[PDB]
Each structure stands twice: as structure tokens, then as C-alpha cells.
Ligand binder design. Structure first.
Ligand code: HEM
Ligand code: HEM
Ligand code: YWO
Ligand code: YWO
Ligand code: H4B
Ligand code: H4B
Lengths: 389, 24, 389, 24
């Protein structure tokens, strides 16, 4: 049975190791990557190409592993991007900023690199795509991990009076956070602390410097009561827990970010029943027939919450993108791609906006989803495998 | 070979050859 | 590469034959079906069960084929329904009406059965689910086929002045129709003729008796100019070109129908650029910012066209269903099903409405798509394989 | 065996066993 509809298929996950990765597999992978890279240069360099092939082979045998040239890493992070079946923004693949923190060693050094990142990328609202590569997995017992699903994310508490406050999606991580000594500010929009694990050590908590988390206060351009819902969201979508695989190497810590596509905050974060779940309150406050589904009131509401989100980001000068423009963009990417290298790994179930499905062009496009390399994999949640001091 | 991929909106078709490089 | 996003995968098609189907494969399939059937009876009948198993085996060997008991066919049509990965209405699976036309022989006899069907099912607007099984494929050279994609469908012409009028989706079938002697009425909503092929003979055309095609005139409940768009649609969604496979047997002709889910006419038929494509005219006539995609005007328009469609069907007393109710319905079906037999072949890419994606519950449900039996397959278009007199 | 299927809206899970009867 085609399992296309599963969220975290094993095929897409790259789990924990206990010992270096077998040279039998590591070597041919590395040769593959090096060929990819030199092969990418318009105008080749066989001298250099051959030299590198050799150098790497040596190192791998003299050390059972190898290190990438900063140039190769910059090429790895983008290709990995380029090969992300579930991203609509890939038309921007070649435009990434890479922060090489491969020489990091402590958690506080991590906490600093992440801050340099959050700051570089936010740019006072003019968002820039960036990535921060930490030390590559070596023996699997010294892995660098970020226990957060994403850099800036809001906490989710379970109130005394039984009601859940904040983002229910993070109720569990939040407890853990609290278990590790974080002071719960019991809000609806409390930015979660960075929980960092460096060189295999138990995880360490760090509050994100408030000045660094840019936020957008939600207000609709016709409805004055929108603002009364006292809603807001962070401007930076930064995925924090994925693994970068390139030429046999695995970087278990490599936060990356882009800008937002409105429907994420719009439809998913706010409207999902298992998230901020604000669809009824917005329905009611619109006078809609909130008690008859056939009235299509949800379709009606959600579009306004979407206009609010977009309106707010534009008004505040924060970068954002609507799903339509996103889709036409991806469509053009896909064509560049088929022309450029005849193919584009694409996952329709993800590439199609969560609203306005068929009004969007990607809905009518047949796609082939396949995992290439380099690639960004998922990982088992650390607290599930981590061995404590 | 290659997989024939089609766009029902514009009748356009593309031939995917890149999948060959798929990992297992 | 998972090819989940392809429309007509071979896996889902059951093409033409040239000779009976090999007893080696036919027999074990038949035994499988018979066991399924007797196995379905609450309170068994092993006597009968065993007797049938034997009877069928005989027949198959004495004739290289076999015939189903009307009871078995009634069970085949529903199970096939029950096992239609791409249908949201399966909660209604056990409620089908079966018209046994297995003794048909001529095209005019077909044209009559179809009319009995179109009439039984329309019911003056109170739609009833029904199916009409024609003679099963025998040697593959005497197949009964309906060349239409669906019973009632509108024609699509290519105007002199270059412009395409009617439903562009059927421009080709329409030509053929014309090539076979049909008189083009050059309208925007001209019901296409039934093109029937019986017992392997060349296809024959028949106009559907106008009194039989119930139609719904489109009018919005706030916008008076909606009616000025002079739009309408047929009330009966009847798939005409699919193959029913049961216990090794193949019925290449078996039209079936249900009622409509608003978004089909609403979003797909009217809004798809390659269909009636009315999204801009509705946008403009709403004063929306039809020239800025970020204005979300399409999301805005399409929801009104959807309210129009639903409003009209209710006002005219024709059966229809909105996508939300459809989705909650399918969700309940799925659970009955997992409880009833632990599984439900479901194709997410199809089961999710073309609008309001994530606002719908099926969007958040993981599904496994697999082909069971009995099943309704697709077929190669007749005019592509048919051998002419 | 059986495939674990989950509903992210309600956290609910189901165990699909019927796929076994899938045709080739
Ligand atoms: C131009 C800025 C970007 C935009 C507008 C964008 C947009 C999106 C969207 C809308 C999604 C679907 C997300 C969801 O359903 O949660 C997505 C997923 C994804 N994007 Fe991006 N993206 C951007 C930049 C990037 C970059 C620079 C990378 C590679 C370094 C990347 C890698 C990914 C991956 C791995 C996913 C899947 C995450 C998961 O499986 O949960 N994106 N992106
Ligand atoms: C209760 C009335 C019914 C409703 C509301 C309903 C609704 C739907 C919808 C919305 C679709 C997706 C269609 C598309 O994208 O074009 C669909 C597809 C389908 N339905 Fe139904 N359905 C009904 C009855 C039935 C029955 C009675 C059968 C079995 C005899 C059936 C078999 C199918 C099949 C085979 C498809 C796929 C057609 C294709 O692949 O093009 N449906 N249905
Ligand atoms: C890089 C990037 C660029 C752009 C977007 N975006 O536009 O929405 C991204 O979104 C996300 C946000 C969160 C997740 C999942 C994450 N929270 C957790 N595993 O659940 C996935 C994609 C990510
Ligand atoms: C039985 C049934 C019940 C209900 C619906 N419905 O609610 O939309 C159906 O729709 C359709 C209508 C047309 C097709 C495709 C057909 N025209 C052609 N192969 O392109 C598929 C499903 C079908
Ligand atoms: C996998 C499961 O079907 C789930 O509901 C989906 C589907 N499509 C998605 N598409 C995007 N972009 N993001 C998601 O989180 C999901 N989740
Ligand atoms: C298969 C290709 O992705 C195509 O655009 C789709 C997708 N999902 C669909 N879902 C339904 N219900 N009906 C369709 O015709 C399609 N077509």
C-alpha cells in the first residue's frame, strides 16, 4: 500500500549511530559527492577533481572519515535544499547563507552561533535564508543536537482549570523544558528556550534574547475587532531538528530558515484544532452561521484570518509570501529544474497549500517524490534515545 | 528510461530522468 | 519514486483482452470471491458455500468462465464501491441500487437501460445511488463499452473566432461525437449524446431524452448578478467508462452514480482554468483586486461560487453535499471500517477537497492506498483500441 | 503484521491489517 500520506516515514528519517559509519559504505558515497561537486562547476577542473578524489580517499582510510571544504559544504546545504521534496520555496535554493560552526565544542558556543543566526536572518524584518552547520556526527556518541523542533516557537501549558493555554503542539517539549529548569511564564505566546546538546553531553537550556525574536501583531484591515483577539506570531520560520546528509557524512545539527508563507500561520498555526484553534471565535465575530457547516462559514473565516496575517506582515515590513505567489513560483522552479537536470523531487501532499487547493497550479501538476543526496532527513526525538549523564 | 509527467492545467508534459539517481 | 501524484497509473487501469482470461488465474480468483461472499453472511451457509465453490469450478472448466448469481453481483458492486480509494461517499456503500442488464445484446437495449438508470437515479431531484451492469467481457472481442466519460456531460466546441465554447475538457470526445453524426448545437451547456458500443460492434450515438437530464440554474443568495452569468449544471454525477472486476470477471460497462459534492461543480468544473474557467469574471463582478494575487481575491471569489452552487441545489430541491459534511462523513466511515475489517483503502490526494484543505478533517488523517477486489478500474479510451468495422 | 496509522488532529491511531489482502 502506497504510504504517501504518512508524516514521518522511516524512509525520510536518519536515526542514531553507535559507531562510525562503515568505510565500505562511506567511501563510495564520498566519491559520489565529490563527483557531483566538481561536476557542478561550469568549466571543469579535472586536476583538482582528481586530486580531491584522492585526498578524500586517503583521509577516509587514514581516519575512517573526512572533512568537507567550506566550499563543498556551501554546495551541500543548497543541493540538500534543492532536493527537499516538501519545500515550495526551492526556487530560492541557490540563495542561502551558510554559517560554518563545525569547530564549535560547547553548548554556550552553540547558543552564540544560533543567536548570530537568528539575528542575521531576521534582519529587522527583511528576512534572509540561512543555515548553521555544527560538528558532523563522528562516533555517534558525540552528536550535536538541538532539542527544539524550531528555533523560535511558543510554549504550550496545561492550565490548572483543565484548559490548555499557548500552543498545544508543544505541550510535551514544554514540560521537558520545565523539567530542565525553565521558568514557565504561563502566557499564550511565550517564546520557548533553546535546549542545546553539544558533543554528546546532556542538554542545556538557554532563553533566547528577547531583542532577537521579531514578532508580528495580528490585525485585519477592515475588522477592528481583529486586534482585540490579541494575536501575534514570530517572523522567523527556522527548522531546528533536521539532519543534513552529504557524501556519507551526517550533520545532526544544522538549523536553517526561510521566510513565511502566509497559510502556515494563517491556516495551520491559528486554525488547526490541535494548535491555536481560533476558527470559531473568528466565525462568531463575523456574524456567520457558525452552527451550520453547509453555510461555508469556515471557508469564509479562514480567508479573513489569512488576509489579516498577510496584511499585518506587510504593514510591519516583515517578509511574507501568499500561497498563490508561492505556487506560481514553485511551478517556474520545477520547469527550470526539469530543463536544468531533468527532474525535481516533489511531494504533492506537501507542496499543495492547505487552503485554495485546486485554485493553485501545483494541484494540477503530477509529481515524482524521491530521496536524493545531499538531503535533509528527520531524526528520532533526542529525549527518546539520549543516554543521560 | 524516463517517467512521463503531465500537467492537467496546461496539458504540458515533462520526462523525469533524475529519479534514477534516487537512493535505494 | 513514489508515483502517488499520477492521475491514471497503470496499476489502476485494466486494459483490453484478446482471448478469455487463463483458467490458471481465473479459477483461484473466483474461489477467492465466492469465499468473500459466503464469508460476508452473518450466520454462514457452508452447505451452500461448498456447493457454490464446486458449481463455479465445474462451469469454469466446462466453459472456461462463469456467471454470478444476481445476489453475488449486488455484493460485488457494493464491495467494489467500498474499496474505491478515491471516493469520499463510501459511508453510503451498502446503499446502492443494481440494475442487471447482463442479458443486453444491442445498443438500443443499452440506450434503454441507461435511460431507466438516469431516470431512476435523478428521481426529480432526490438523488439515489445506482449502478447498471452490462454483459461481462468474454473473449475480449465482444466487450460492451460506453464511450462517454460520464452519462450526462456538456459538449465543448472550438469556435470559428478562435475562442473555445462549452466545456473544453470534452473538446475531443465532442469532435468524435460529431464525426459519428451528432448535430453540434454550439451551446455552452449542450448535453453530450450517449455513444454506445454493444457486443463489440462499432459505437452508436443516441441523444439523451431532454426530459431526463435534470439541471440546476446557478444563483447566489445575495448577488443578483450571479444569475446574469447564466450558468447551470446537471444534477447527476454518473461515471460511465470504468471497469468492474470481481472474482476474475471483468464488466467493461457498468455506469454508476451518486449525488454531488458541491466543490466538484463549485471549484473544479467552474473554476479550473481548463474547464468553464469563471474565476476572474466572478472576481471582477465582486469589485475585488483581481490584479493582485496577494489580495486573496481568488480565495474570496471561489467561496462565493461555492455558496451559489450549494444555494441553488437546495433551493431547487436537488440533492447535494458540501465538502465539510462530506469529510466528517468519510471520517466516520473510515472508523466503522477499521473496526469492521481493520483497514480502508484511501487515497488522500483525492479524498481531500480541492478547497479548504486542512479545515477538513481528512487532511489530518494518515491513509493507506491499496487496490483490493472487487474493484472499479480505469480503461484505455475505446477509440484508441477499438477495431472498426 | 499491521501498519500504524495516525490522526494528527485527534492523536488517534489505527492499525491497518486489511492491506495484506492487497492484490500484487
Ligand atoms: C525562500 C524562503 C522559504 C520558503 C517561502 C519556504 C517555504 C516552505 C513551506 C511552505 C514548507 C511546507 C512547510 C510545512 O508544511 O510546515 C516548507 C518546508 C520545508 N522547507 Fe522550506 N521554505 C523556505 C526556505 C527553505 C530553505 C532555505 C530550505 C533548505 C535550507 C528549506 C527546507 C525545507 C524543508 C526541509 C521542509 C520540510 C520540513 C518538514 O518536513 O517539516 N526551506 N518550506
Ligand atoms: C453518496 C453519493 C456519492 C458521493 C457524494 C460521492 C462523491 C465522490 C467524490 C467527491 C469523488 C472524487 C471525485 C473527483 O475528483 O472527480 C468520488 C469519486 C469516485 N466515486 Fe463517488 N460518490 C458517491 C457515490 C459513489 C458510488 C455509489 C460509487 C460506487 C458505485 C462511487 C465510486 C467512485 C469512484 C470509482 C470514484 C473515482 C472516479 C475517478 O477515478 O475518476 N461513488 N466520489
Ligand atoms: C525552513 C523553513 C522555511 C519556511 C517555512 N514556512 O514558510 O512555513 C518553514 O516552515 C516550517 C515550520 C515548521 C516545520 C515543522 C517543525 N515546527 C516541527 N518539526 O514540527 C516545518 C516547516 C521552514
Ligand atoms: C459516481 C460519482 C458520484 C459522485 C461524484 N461527485 O460527487 O462528483 C462523482 O464525480 C465524478 C465525476 C466525474 C469523474 C471523472 C469523469 N468525468 C472523467 N473520467 O473525467 C469522476 C468522479 C462520481
Ligand atoms: C501526512 C498527513 O497527511 C498530514 O496531515 C499532512 C499533509 N500535508 C501536509 N502538507 C504540509 N505542507 N505540511 C504538513 O504538516 C502536512 N501534513
Ligand atoms: C493527479 C493530479 O495530481 C491531479 O491534479 C489531481 C489531484 N487530486 C485530485 N483529487 C480529486 N478528488 N480529483 C481529481 O481530479 C484530482 N486530480
Amino acid at each position: 500500500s502506497c504510504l504517501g500520506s504518512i508524516m514521518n516515514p522511516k524512509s525520510l528519517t536518519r536515526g542514531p549511530r553507535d559507531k562510525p559509519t562503515p568505510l565500505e559504505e562511506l567511501l563510495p558515497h564520498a566519491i559520489e559527492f565529490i563527483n557531483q561537486y566538481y561536476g557542478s562547476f561550469k568549466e571543469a577542473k579535472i586536476e583538482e577533481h582528481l586530486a580531491r578524489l584522492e585526498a578524500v580517499t586517503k583521509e577516509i582510510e587514514t581516519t575512517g572519515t573526512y572533512q568537507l571544504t567550506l566550499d563543498e559544504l556551501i554546495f551541500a546545504t543548497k543541493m540538500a535544499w534543492r532536493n527537499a521534496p516538501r519545500c515550495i520555496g526551492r526556487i530560492q535554493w541557490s540563495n542561502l547563507q551558510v554559517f560554518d560552526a563545525r569547530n564549535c565544542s560547547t553548548a554556550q558556543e552553540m547558543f552564540q552561533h544560533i543567536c548570530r543566526h537568528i539575528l542575521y536572518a531576521t534582519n529587522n524584518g527583511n528576512i534572509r535564508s540561512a543555515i548553521t552547520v555544527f560538528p558532523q556526527r563522528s562516533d555517534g556518541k558525540h552528536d550535536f543536537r538541538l532539542w527544539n523542533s524550531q528555533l523560535i516557537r511558543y510554549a504550550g501549558y496545561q492550565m490548572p482549570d483543565g484548559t490548555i493555554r499557548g500552543d498545544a503542539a508543544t505541550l510535551e517539549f514544554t514540560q521537558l523544558c520545565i523539567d530542565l529548569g525553565w521558568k514557565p511564564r504561563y502566557g499564550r505566546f511565550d517564546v520557548l528556550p533553546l535546549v542545546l546538546q553539544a558533543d554528546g553531553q546532556d542538554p542545556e537550556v538557554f532563553e533566547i534574547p528577547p531583542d532577537l525574536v521579531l514578532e508580528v501583531t495580528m490585525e485585519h484591515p477592515k475588522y477592528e475587532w481583529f486586534q482585540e483577539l490579541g494575536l501575534k506570531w514570530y517572523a522567523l520560520p527556522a527548522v531546528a531538528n533536521m539532519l543534513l546528509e552529504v557524501g556519507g557524512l551526517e550533520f545532526p545539527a544544522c538549523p536553517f530558515n526561510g521566510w513565511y508563507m502566509g497559510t502556515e500561520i494563517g491556516v495551520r498555526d491559528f486554525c488547526d484544532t490541535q494548535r491555536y484553534n481560533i476558527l470559531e471565535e473568528v466565525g462568531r465575530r463575523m456574524g456567520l452561521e457558525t452552527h451550520t457547516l453547509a453555510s461555508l462559514w469556515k471557508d469564509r473565516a479562514v480567508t479573513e484570518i489569512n488576509v489579516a496575517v498577510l496584511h499585518s506582515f506587510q504593514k510591519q515590513n516583515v517578509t511574507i509570501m501568499d500561497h498563490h505567489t508561492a505556487s506560481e513560483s514553485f511551478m517556474k522552479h520545477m520547469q527550470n529544474e526539469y530543463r536544468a537536470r531533468g527532474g525535481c523531487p516533489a511531494d504533492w501532499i506537501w507542496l499543495v497549500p492547505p487552503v485554495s487547493g485546486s485554485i493553485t497550479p501545483v494541484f494540477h501538476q503530477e509529481m515524482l517524490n524521491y530521496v536524493l543526496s545531499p538531503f535533509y532527513y528527520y531524526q528520532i526525538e533526542p529525549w527518546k534515545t539520549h543516554i543521560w549523564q | 528510461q524516463y517517467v512521463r509527467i503531465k500537467n492537467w492545467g496546461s496539458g504540458e508534459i515533462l520526462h523525469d530522468t533524475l529519479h534514477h539517481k534516487a537512493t535505494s
